[PDB]
Amino acid sequence: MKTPITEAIAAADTQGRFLSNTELQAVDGRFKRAVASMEAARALTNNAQSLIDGAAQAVYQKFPYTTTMQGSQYASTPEGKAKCARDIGYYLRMITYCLVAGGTGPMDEYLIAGLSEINSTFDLSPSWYIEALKYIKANHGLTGQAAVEANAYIDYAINALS
Amino acid sequence: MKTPITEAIAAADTQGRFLSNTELQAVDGRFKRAVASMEAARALTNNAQSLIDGAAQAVYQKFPYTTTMQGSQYASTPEGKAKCARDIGYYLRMITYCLVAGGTGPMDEYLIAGLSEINSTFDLSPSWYIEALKYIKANHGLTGQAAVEANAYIDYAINALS
Amino acid sequence: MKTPITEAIAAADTQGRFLSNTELQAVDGRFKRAVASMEAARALTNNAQSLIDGAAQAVYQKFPYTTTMQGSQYASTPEGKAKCARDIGYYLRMITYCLVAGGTGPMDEYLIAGLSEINSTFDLSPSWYIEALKYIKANHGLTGQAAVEANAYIDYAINALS
Amino acid sequence: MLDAFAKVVAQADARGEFLTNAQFDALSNLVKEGNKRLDAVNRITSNASTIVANAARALFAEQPQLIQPGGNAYTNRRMAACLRDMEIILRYVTYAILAGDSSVLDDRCLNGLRETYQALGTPGSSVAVAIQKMKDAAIAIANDPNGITPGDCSALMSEIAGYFDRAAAAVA
Amino acid sequence: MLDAFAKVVAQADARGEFLTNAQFDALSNLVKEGNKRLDAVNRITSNASTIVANAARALFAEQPQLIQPGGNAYTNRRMAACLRDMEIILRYVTYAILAGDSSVLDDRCLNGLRETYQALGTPGSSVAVAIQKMKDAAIAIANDPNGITPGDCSALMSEIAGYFDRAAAAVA
Amino acid sequence: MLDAFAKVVAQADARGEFLTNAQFDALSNLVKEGNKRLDAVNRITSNASTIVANAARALFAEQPQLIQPGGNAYTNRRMAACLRDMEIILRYVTYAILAGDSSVLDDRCLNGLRETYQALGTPGSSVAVAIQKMKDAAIAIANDPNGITPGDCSALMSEIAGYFDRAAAAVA
Numbered sequence A, B, C: 001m002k003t004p005i006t007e008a009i010a011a012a013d014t015q016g017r018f019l020s021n022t023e024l025q026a027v028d029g030r031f032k033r034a035v036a037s038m039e040a041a042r043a044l045t046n047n048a049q050s051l052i053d054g055a056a057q058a059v060y061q062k063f064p065y066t067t068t069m070q071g072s073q074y075a076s077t078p079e080g081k082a083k084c085a086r087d088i089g090y091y092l093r094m095i096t097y098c099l100v101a102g103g104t105g106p107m108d109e110y111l112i113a114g115l116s117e118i119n120s121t122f123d124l125s126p127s128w129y130i131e132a133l134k135y136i137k138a139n140h141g142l143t144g145q146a147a148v149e150a151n152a153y154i155d156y157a158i159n160a161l162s
Numbered sequence D, E, F: 001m002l003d004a005f006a007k008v009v010a011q012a013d014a015r016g017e018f019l020t021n022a023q024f025d026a027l028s029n030l031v032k033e034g035n036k037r038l039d040a041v042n043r044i045t046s047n048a049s050t051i052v053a054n055a056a057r058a059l060f061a062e063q064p065q066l067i068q069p070g071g072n073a074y075t076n077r078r079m080a081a082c083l084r085d086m087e088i089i090l091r092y093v094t095y096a097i098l099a100g101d102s103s104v105l106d107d108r109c110l111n112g113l114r115e116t117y118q119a120l121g122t123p124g125s126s127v128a129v130a131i132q133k134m135k136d137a138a139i140a141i142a143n144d145p146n147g148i149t150p151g152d153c154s155a156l157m158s159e160i161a162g163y164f165d166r167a168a169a170a171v172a
């Protein structure tokens, strides 16, 4: 999994070298940034349900047809609504994992790999998820570097969907 | 084994693709041509013994020394004569297989692969077999497209010996 | 192991060929040269102890500090002196093996491969061994082609240490 | 690989025999039934995406444990791999239908697949369910009377069903 | 590979759960102890050559059979390979220390090593002795009170000892 | 690989010993018998094609089942592979003769050959017959008194026979 620490080790290992000061500084950076990262992760986790509920409703408001159109790919049924809330929860959970791990690893492995395929096969519109992510970014209530950390991963997900 | 059908499948598979209309047409061509091919195969099979007997004697007439020269590579002995008739029968059998399969596969796999080696190691003259094949081509009694199908494979063998 | 015979076989084998006169001559050369080579090997072996003892003392005389400096890499202790005599004996033994085998194989496999590493890790000076080898070359008492054979391998070792 | 024709030829060669009249007639009948075979391949292939997607959706609805966090189809990478396997199996089954022989399916897909899933921890039994669902859909599509010259393709459908069942048994 | 943080994340994902407050606190404490971890890695790495060389010299002094003609460390090529293995093991152990997880050590070194030595004829028991000697030296160096801000690194040293023992057990 | 000389050296090195006078004399005698060894290799190699072809023709005459349709030497590709194996074995045997050691033969040919034929379905017993026929022909050619300085090569012929028998036993 990709993190500031595994990347440092991977680099040294690929060169068959012991870790050098060059890599020990990268980890120090990760440790110092962890303060803001963890603050963001705790906040997003504490307010997970309201952010998920609000995000789903941002999507339905931006794309009204997703609440009425006939088809299992939409949330016009109770099952579809549950699938959508579940998915948004997955995205938020992944964001908190990235913050905790200090890197995109988590999201890369559990969500982004195969994302395009999945959206294509099940006829899910990437724009739906981008709207949910934009809602989370606008309403997580974070400021300072904690916001910077949260937004970096939210935008990373948005770019992966673009 | 190389045939119009396995070639179509091999192509699709190499590209990791489902069969397309591009390949389904190739097989249709094979199915339509099968009428003439099978007519040729049945005829050659029905008259196999006379064609084999006549072909051997065309070879002995073209190359008289093969009936008198001392050496196991010649047909100057009963054993040599039997080996020669056997070989010519092999060639004819292969031709009928190609007609049935709709391709050169059979002959490629069972006879052509290793042919040069074999002729070299056992001191068998390719010209002997070319003469036998020419006799079969001139005397199979086929006409129209059935002849075209039979001659295509007979000439394929001749080219392999050239 | 590299010798005039294994090299001949390796060449033929890499080309998937039977041995040719080209290789049979190389082996004949090895057999003819063996007379001088064996003479050298027998002499060096017969006088091994005096050559080893004399060589160690050439090293200590050229580099006096190796007999007084504090450290396990030096021969200032009984253990260090034994290690040094042992090492010089190894070099001489390898030289006789090369003479017997007709090639550098022996020395290449048992001593040269990993030599640089070893000298670096244990802080052994290559110059110490070069001096020992120079002593052996100057005092083996061989003449003619026997000397030429002995010196070829002694110089080979010196070059490996350079 | 081998197709239906090459198969007969291979058997004859091992015996060193020309084909018999009974064999020639058999192969000639395969050719006569060629149009139906091509229709089946065309129809199934033309609906490959929905056959796979519908079967997958059905499988996950019946076995929700597969998509739950920790389940073998959980995470997009795992789901993608699962969808891929379904399309791969369907692809090779259609190759077998075109060839009129299971050799390509057995060689390039089936063989070794059971051991592959066991090493991964993928439930072969569930894969078999997915394969059976694609069967049923593929046959319904291939044997749909609408928009095609009327005729009996029952024998062919039995053959097609056999290839699917063969795949299901190789992973179950 | 995984580091201490990724490990917690992986466990949470398999459960489909956000982290608990008890977990967040645990990871936050790992970060707070980061400086000590970096010092340990820096100190051991900075003395890698002597740790290996001293341990090797000690091993061969105690087990002279290894360097005697015919022994597994006899000939320079064999000695070089042995010294290399010692540095490789130390290298991966330091990676584990930085990561706070043994995954990298187990995956890229330990696993399969026992079978590797058995095939070669290399005495795994002797390798274990070499590893234990490097432990003791590495810990003495990492936990040396001189030239560093006073503090308790006992927990970290126990962790470090664990990685070395894990390596010793994988070859013994 | 190793030749007769390298073999003695390897044994001495494992013991950490210089060669003894008894050994030096032995190796010196190998050199003195070198001309005979070179003649044997030259003669066998110079007649390689007929040795293989005659042995093959003899084998197929005695065991016609091998060339009958369905037999392991049936089809030109199979016959070619069989002739190739015979030349390969003869080639490696001559390498052993030149080296005065079977190491090259065992390593680069024999080892693993029995398992190779079993997987293919090739009758190892028949291969052994082919090898024995090439023996007899090779020795008759190598030990032919005509056109060579008179002398006793009985010991060498026994050595040569040993290499052939070693090959026959590795596949039988």
Ligand SMILES: *[C@@H](C)[C@H]1/C(=C/c2[nH]c(/C=C3N=C(/C=C4\NC(=O)C(CC)=C4C)C(C)=C\3CCC(=O)O)c(CCC(=O)O)c2C)NC(=O)[C@@H]1C
Residues within 6 Å of the ligand: B021, B024, B025, B028, D032, D033, D035, D036, D037, D038, D039, D040, D042, D142, D143, D144, D145, D146, D148, D149, D150, D151, D152, D153, D156
């Ligand atoms: C069973 C599978 C169903 C069925 C089949 C059926 N098909 C035909 C006839 C034809 N099918 C084709 C199709 C192709 N020819 C091709 O070369 C290709 C690939 C490029 C395809 C897809 C053609 C040309 C024919 C003949 C002309 C026609 O349209 O009739 C028949 C008729 C008989 C015969 O064998 O041809 C039948 C019975 N019919 C059904 O009711 C099943 C649901």
Ligand SMILES: *[C@@H](C)[C@H]1/C(=C/c2[nH]c(/C=C3N=C(/C=C4\NC(=O)C(CC)=C4C)C(C)=C\3CCC(=O)O)c(CCC(=O)O)c2C)NC(=O)[C@@H]1C
Residues within 6 Å of the ligand: A021, A024, A025, A028, E032, E033, E035, E036, E037, E038, E039, E040, E042, E142, E143, E144, E145, E146, E148, E149, E150, E151, E152, E153, E156
């Ligand atoms: C146990 C291992 C010993 C010990 C450790 C100890 N270290 C510190 C503090 C610091 N260590 C560093 C070192 C680094 N920071 C880095 O980014 C890197 C890689 C480039 C290294 C090597 C730093 C910067 C500090 C803080 C400032 C300082 O020098 O104090 C402490 C203090 C507390 C805390 O955690 O920082 C301690 C206790 N102390 C011992 O007595 C053991 C022998």
Ligand SMILES: *[C@@H](C)[C@H]1/C(=C/c2[nH]c(/C=C3N=C(/C=C4\NC(=O)C(CC)=C4C)C(C)=C\3CCC(=O)O)c(CCC(=O)O)c2C)NC(=O)[C@@H]1C
Residues within 6 Å of the ligand: C021, C024, C025, C028, F032, F033, F035, F036, F037, F038, F039, F040, F042, F142, F143, F144, F145, F146, F148, F149, F150, F151, F152, F153, F156
């Ligand atoms: C047993 C195998 C038969 C036999 C052998 C025999 N050979 C020789 C002598 C020589 N053989 C050679 C041949 C070569 N020298 C080479 O360098 C090469 C490769 C390029 C070859 C092929 C030579 C040069 C000699 C010496 C000169 C000569 O022709 O005599 C002997 C004589 C003794 C000795 O060892 O030389 C013998 C006995 N003799 C037989 O009767 C066996 C059938």
Ligand SMILES: *[C@H](C)[C@H]1/C(=C/c2[nH]c(/C=C3N=C(/C=C4\NC(=O)C(CC)=C4C)C(C)=C\3CCC(=O)O)c(CCC(=O)O)c2C)NC(=O)[C@@H]1C
Residues within 6 Å of the ligand: A059, A060, A066, A067, A072, A073, A074, A075, A076, A079, A080, A081, A083, A084, A085, A087, A088, A090, A091, A110, A111, A118, A122, A124, A128, A129, A132, D057, D060, D067, D073, D074, D075, D076, D079
């Ligand atoms: C919500 C924004 C909209 C919506 C969602 C919706 N999604 C699905 C189905 C799936 N969603 C996923 C996504 C993931 N699976 C993962 O493992 C991960 C990473 C942990 C993600 C992000 C997948 C794989 C599926 C299909 C398989 C399944 O059902 O789980 C559906 C159902 C589609 C169907 O046909 O059954 C729906 C409705 N739909 C909307 O209209 C919202 C605007």
Ligand SMILES: *[C@H](C)[C@H]1/C(=C/c2[nH]c(/C=C3N=C(/C=C4\NC(=O)C(CC)=C4C)C(C)=C\3CCC(=O)O)c(CCC(=O)O)c2C)NC(=O)[C@@H]1C
Residues within 6 Å of the ligand: B059, B060, B066, B067, B072, B073, B074, B075, B076, B079, B080, B081, B083, B084, B085, B087, B088, B090, B091, B110, B111, B118, B122, B124, B128, B129, B132, F057, F060, F067, F073, F074, F075, F076, F079
């Ligand atoms: C006939 C035109 C002339 C002739 C023939 C002759 N052939 C052989 C021996 C062999 N022929 C083959 C050929 C094949 N083997 C195959 O498996 C296939 C494909 C199915 C072919 C075409 C082979 C392999 C042999 C050698 C092995 C064997 O005996 O089967 C001989 C005998 C040679 C010998 O030395 O024993 C002869 C005489 N010879 C003529 O003069 C005719 C003009």
Ligand SMILES: *[C@H](C)[C@H]1/C(=C/c2[nH]c(/C=C3N=C(/C=C4\NC(=O)C(CC)=C4C)C(C)=C\3CCC(=O)O)c(CCC(=O)O)c2C)NC(=O)[C@@H]1C
Residues within 6 Å of the ligand: C059, C060, C066, C067, C072, C073, C074, C075, C076, C079, C080, C081, C083, C084, C085, C087, C088, C090, C091, C110, C111, C118, C122, C124, C128, C129, C132, E057, E060, E067, E073, E074, E075, E076, E079
């Ligand atoms: C002598 C010229 C000087 C000297 C020698 C000295 N050498 C060592 C230690 C080692 N020497 C070797 C060399 C070899 N090992 C081999 O297997 C081979 C090929 C067969 C060779 C050439 C090795 C591997 C070692 C280290 C391992 C061991 O002890 O065997 C020492 C001891 C170093 C130590 O720290 O213990 C010494 C003293 N030293 C001098 O000052 C002489 C001038």
Ligand SMILES: *[C@H](C)[C@H]1/C(=C/c2[nH]c(/C=C3N=C(/C=C4\NC(=O)C(CC)=C4C)C(C)=C\3CCC(=O)O)c(CCC(=O)O)c2C)NC(=O)[C@@H]1C
Residues within 6 Å of the ligand: D066, D071, D072, D073, D078, D079, D081, D082, D083, D085, D086, D088, D108, D109, D110, D113, D116, D120, D122, D123, D126, D127, D130
């Ligand atoms: C879907 C219905 C079920 C499922 C599937 C699943 N499969 C894999 C992984 C692999 N599948 C294969 C199979 C093939 N590869 C081939 O090239 C071919 C022939 C063309 C076949 C048949 C292979 C090789 C793999 C592993 C390599 C890879 O993943 O790319 C996975 C992934 C497992 C993982 O941990 O990575 C999954 C999830 N899983 C289910 O739950 C369904 C029942």
Ligand SMILES: *[C@H](C)[C@H]1/C(=C/c2[nH]c(/C=C3N=C(/C=C4\NC(=O)C(CC)=C4C)C(C)=C\3CCC(=O)O)c(CCC(=O)O)c2C)NC(=O)[C@@H]1C
Residues within 6 Å of the ligand: E066, E071, E072, E073, E078, E079, E081, E082, E083, E085, E086, E088, E108, E109, E110, E113, E116, E120, E122, E123, E126, E127, E130
């Ligand atoms: C030293 C304390 C002991 C010893 C070691 C010894 N090891 C080998 C050979 C190999 N060791 C490995 C191990 C690894 N390779 C890797 O890439 C990794 C991960 C990065 C590991 C752990 C391998 C693969 C080999 C074989 C390949 C090679 O030699 O390069 C040898 C050599 C044995 C030989 O005969 O060539 C030796 C001597 N030997 C001892 O006596 C000590 C107890």
Ligand SMILES: *[C@H](C)[C@H]1/C(=C/c2[nH]c(/C=C3N=C(/C=C4\NC(=O)C(CC)=C4C)C(C)=C\3CCC(=O)O)c(CCC(=O)O)c2C)NC(=O)[C@@H]1C
Residues within 6 Å of the ligand: F066, F071, F072, F073, F078, F079, F081, F082, F083, F085, F086, F088, F108, F109, F110, F113, F116, F120, F122, F123, F126, F127, F130
């Ligand atoms: C001939 C006397 C008998 C016989 C032989 C036969 N062998 C094969 C196939 C193979 N033989 C080998 C052996 C080697 N390959 C090597 O590189 C070396 C060392 C240089 C050896 C010893 C191998 C690897 C194969 C398989 C690969 C290949 O075919 O190229 C066959 C072919 C079997 C097939 O089905 O393709 C045959 C027929 N067969 C007999 O009946 C004789 C008793």
